[PDB]
């Protein structure tokens, strides 16, 4: 017959990812301190 071994497709496989994809998220340093002191002022008031 003809060779039917495990072969990659003639079009090649799909993309592969090799990155440190840690996502930037959250707030800015000024914002956290500001909102933190705002709650404290609310708590005191």
Partner 1 sequence: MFMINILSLIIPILLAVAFLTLVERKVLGYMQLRKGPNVVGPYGLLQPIADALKLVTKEPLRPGTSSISMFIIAPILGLSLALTMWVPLPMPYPLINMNLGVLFMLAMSSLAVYSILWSGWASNSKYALIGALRAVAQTISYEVTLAIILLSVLLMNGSYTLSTLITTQEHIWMIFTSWPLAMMWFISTLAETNRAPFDLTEGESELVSGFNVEYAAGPFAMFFMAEYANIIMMNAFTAILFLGASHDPHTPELYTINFVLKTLALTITFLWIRASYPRFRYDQLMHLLWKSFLPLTLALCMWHISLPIMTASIPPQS
Partner 2 sequence: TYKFVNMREPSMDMKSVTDRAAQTLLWTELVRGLGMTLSYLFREPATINYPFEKGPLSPRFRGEHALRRYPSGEERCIACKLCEAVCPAQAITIEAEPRADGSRRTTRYDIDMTKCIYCGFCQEACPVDAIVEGPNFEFSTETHEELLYNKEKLLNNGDKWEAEIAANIQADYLYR
Ligand X SMILES: CCCCCCCCCCCCCCCCCC(=O)OC[C@H](COP(=O)([O-])OCC[N+](C)(C)C)OC(=O)CCCCCCCCCCCCCCCCC
CB 39, min distance to partner 2, A: 12
CB 29, min distance to partner 1, A: 16
Rg of the chain over Cα atoms, rounded to whole angstroms, equals 27
Q: How far is CA 3 from CA 13, 16, 33, in A?
A: 20, 28, 67
DSSP line for 6-28: S---TT-------S--PPP-S--
**30: partner contacted, choices partner 2, partner 1, ligand X, none (Cβ within 5-8 A by kind):** partner 2
* Nearer to partner 2 among residue 9 and residue 26 (C-beta): 26
* Nearer to partner 1 among residue 30 and residue 45 (C-beta): 45
């Amino acid at each position: 017959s003809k060779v039917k071994q495990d072969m990659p497709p003639p079009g090649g496989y799909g993309p592969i990812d090799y990155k440190r994809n840690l996502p930037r998220r959250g707030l800015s340093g000024y914002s956290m301190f500001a909102v933190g002191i705002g709650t404290l002022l609310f708590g005191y008031w």
